[PDB]
Amino acid sequence: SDAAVDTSSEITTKDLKEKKEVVEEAEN
């Protein structure tokens, strides 16, 4: 199924620094 997301399994760490930055900005 990740082939329909252009193999997000390689980039997901860049996505998770998003999910930690977006989330600190939700507590700020």
Side-chain angles (χ1 to χ4, degrees):
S1 304
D2 195 32
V5 207
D6 193 43
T7 315
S8 70
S9 304
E10 294 187 270
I11 62 148
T12 179
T13 305
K14 300 180 178 182
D15 191 81
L16 286 163
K17 274 75 185 294
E18 215 185 87
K19 296 306 193 294
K20 288 179 181 290
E21 182 176 85
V22 85
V23 89
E24 277 188 272
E25 286 287 87
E27 292 187 272
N28 184 12

